[PDB]
Amino acid sequence: TNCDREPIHIPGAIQPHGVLLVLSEPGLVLTHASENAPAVLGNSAEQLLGAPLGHFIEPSVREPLEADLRSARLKQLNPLKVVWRVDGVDRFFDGIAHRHQGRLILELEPSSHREAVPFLSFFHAVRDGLSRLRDARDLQELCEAVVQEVRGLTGFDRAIIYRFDAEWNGSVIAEARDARADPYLGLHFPASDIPRQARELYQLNWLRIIPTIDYQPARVRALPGHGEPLDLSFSVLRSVSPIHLEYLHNMGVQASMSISLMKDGKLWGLISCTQVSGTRYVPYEVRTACEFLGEVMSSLLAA
Amino acid sequence: TNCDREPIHIPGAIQPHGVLLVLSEPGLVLTHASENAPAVLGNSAEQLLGAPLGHFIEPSVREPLEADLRSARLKQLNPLKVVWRVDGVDRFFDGIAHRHQGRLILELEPSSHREAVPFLSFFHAVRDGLSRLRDARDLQELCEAVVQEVRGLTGFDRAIIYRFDAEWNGSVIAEARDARADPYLGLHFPASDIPRQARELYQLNWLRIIPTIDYQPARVRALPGHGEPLDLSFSVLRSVSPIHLEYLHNMGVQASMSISLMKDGKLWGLISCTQVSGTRYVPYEVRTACEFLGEVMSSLLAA
Ligand SMILES: */C=C\C1=C(C)C(=O)N/C1=C\c1[nH]c(Cc2[nH]c(/C=C3\NC(=O)C(C=C)=C3C)c(C)c2CCC(=O)O)c(CCC(=O)O)c1C
Ligand SMILES: */C=C\C1=C(C)C(=O)N/C1=C\c1[nH]c(Cc2[nH]c(/C=C3\NC(=O)C(C=C)=C3C)c(C)c2CCC(=O)O)c(CCC(=O)O)c1C
């Protein structure tokens, strides 16, 4: 059987800090809703399933949101501004929507604290980060620049560059760390620690975040006739493989984030961040800044 | 005498769509002010020279603005939010401040129309642009991607990649254009069209914009004992060489913007945009998005 066979893209559940909805097209009827929607949204699955999205959206946000969800050209439009009028009292969310395997999936994460101008942090993060990455004169300086930059933006206890060999064993070739985190720099690990179906998924979906490894997976409920396993390959809230969560627990890690490094269309390595402390709910603008720096580093893996 | 000798970094004047101030440190006393300040700011040079900056700033913006100007770490903090309370009635500006040759220069450009969330356009421009640049498989596709991207963001009639040879002659190696603009693709030009002191300045200051070639230069006035030619090398409002403005007039160009392409610390080429139509007051977020794409392209000039 071994490591490579557990699926991972169809867990049937999400990480409960956000809500996952599936929307029909073109009508935007909710055909799936994750069952943590009462805690996060103020509505039940029963109120949600089969209702049109617009019924729950503050009316002045509604028309542009529906226009974006139908756009196809959908991020490029992410993040979507979603304002949920429940009882009502608005709740504010960043929507990340995508199409995959014929379904339109909308993920909702509570909008960040502040007031502190939208997208200003991303502007500074990628400008300052790009010039630090360009200062690097070789691969090893590039790696150290990225890991210092990502740890600064996220606050993670540890950030490494994890590089794959021929073979798919990995090596910790650069590390930035708080002093509370043991040093993994220089360690090599077998290929099965990131098994083959994970590596294949990470060639397509370049960012994953587990802000706490202790969560109760929120099942995705569906209208009768619907689900059938939801392919969650491109969903940021996808519940991750339980055996990886026990790897993290045994390693003493409470939260994780990694970013794929690509070279010639093939997975080259990861930027891997870990928290030994407590949780790490990285905000949207920070995650996206980090993933953007991973793309820059990936494009600089040349000569 | 010839082309290489006219200075260009000390014209004594600026392009009048913004205001240039020089500030003492640490006290932020205005020692220089451009003479278009009545039109743009609502104050005269006489009211400005020798007054502390804070006297003109809306009080809730004032402390953070002064903190930034003293920071050193100054962009990284650009753009500064500057709210000018004159009579009073607030006016809103993006401040771009820099230190050079011992002076602290603050340039003020009216804040953009809207309402349309700050920095959202930059977020989308650099994300969408980076992935189009990464799609390029060789230098020629890179060049065509950049020129299509920059023309899309700015609306310029023409955008070219202008590459320097051994020698500093130039070649138009890629072009995107409205059909109203004659094609320069494939043309070669002598080194003197971008003379040596311009090329040296452009190795240090990677962006220049002339939103209309028909402007009355606004003299920079100074307190007695002060100016002495203000070195405007890193100032975005620097009035450009009059002979270049007549080159543009004869070429039939009403507005221009170029971005330096760097390779191994040496000027490699320019992204050059021209308007045959009318003016081109490119907004701050667009200019910065374009310059960021120029840095990415510069970093990809490798192998
Ligand atoms: C055969 C089953 C598995 C064994 C044994 C094992 O050790 N992992 C197994 C399955 C598995 N791993 C992952 C994802 C994963 N694994 C890592 C490994 C590391 N994290 C570190 O900090 C270090 C060394 C310092 C290593 C090595 C990483 C980075 C990841 C990516 C996720 C993350 O960033 O935390 C999966 C997929 C989990 C999922 O995507 O659902 C599986 C099934
Ligand atoms: C000896 C004096 C000069 C002669 C003769 C001439 O032709 N230019 C001279 C001086 C000069 N040029 C510049 C800056 C400059 N020149 C160009 C040239 C081109 N623009 C085009 O569209 C093309 C071809 C399609 C060419 C060739 C460019 C792009 C620039 C940069 C400024 C801009 O983007 O418009 C200067 C410096 C002007 C300044 O920075 O003050 C000078 C003195």
Residue numbers in the entry:
A (entry chain A), B (entry chain A): 16 to 318
What do the study's own words say?
Phytochromes are red-light photoreceptors found in various plants and microorganisms. S. aurantiaca contains two previously uncharacterized bacteriophytochromes (BphPs) denoted SaBphP1 and SaBphP2, which may be responsible for the light-stimulated growth of multicellular fruiting bodies.
In the classical BphPs, the equivalent His forms a critical hydrogen bond to the BV ring D that stabilizes the Pr state. SaBphP1 contains a threonine (Thr289) at this position, which is replaced by glycine in some myxobacterial BphPs. However, the T289H mutation hardly changes the overall structure of the CBD dimer as the root-mean-square deviation (r.m.s.d.) between wild-type and mutant is on the order of 0.3 Å.
